[PDB]
Amino acid sequence: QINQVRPKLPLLKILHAAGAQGEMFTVKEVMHYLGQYIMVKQLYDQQEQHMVYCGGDLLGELLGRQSFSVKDPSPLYDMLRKNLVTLAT
Ligand SMILES: COc1cccc([C@@H]2N=C(c3ccc(OC)cc3OC(C)C)N(C(=O)N3CCNC(=O)C3)[C@@H]2c2ccc(Cl)cc2)c1
């Protein structure tokens, strides 16, 4: 209810697969369900949780690659800006 916008359609399918329902979502509203999705699907390595391997996911089939490290916010913001539709650049 923060006058927020809609994400990319495969992101909305990943949110539905997490058990959610929606149209408009913030990065925080996405993340609540995306952390839950990655945990229930196990899209991470138990020993290196600082990486997620979405290149094998719908996020990967959309972007051609979506495997990344969570410790590096700059390339992560560049990916987010393509998967959650917004301003910038
Ligand atoms: C700005 O938007 C973000 C984008 C990417 C990452 C983050 C955040 N970084 C981590 C996280 C960080 C470190 C880590 O391990 C060292 C594990 C993490 O969780 C993933 C494995 C799900 N995320 C988590 O969900 N967490 C971190 C906090 N505690 C948890 O149990 C789960 C967030 C996340 C992950 C993926 C997405 Cl698509 C969205 C949100 C925010």
Curated annotation (Swiss-Prot):
Origin superkingdom: Eukaryota
Signals that turn on the gene: Down-regulated by cisplatin (at protein level).
Coiled coil: none
Localization of this protein: Nucleus
Function: Along with MDM2, contributes to TP53 regulation. Inhibits p53/TP53- and TP73/p73-mediated cell cycle arrest and apoptosis by binding its transcriptional activation domain. Inhibits degradation of MDM2. Can reverse MDM2-targeted degradation of TP53 while maintaining suppression of TP53 transactivation and apoptotic functions.
Disease: Bone marrow failure syndrome 6: A form of bone marrow failure syndrome, a heterogeneous group of life-threatening disorders characterized by hematopoietic defects in association with a range of variable extra-hematopoietic manifestations. BMFS6 is an autosomal dominant form characterized by intermittent neutropenia, lymphopenia, or anemia associated with hypocellular bone marrow, and increased susceptibility to cancer.
Family, similarity comment: Belongs to the MDM2/MDM4 family.
Name of the protein this chain belongs to: Protein Mdm4
Native species: Homo sapiens
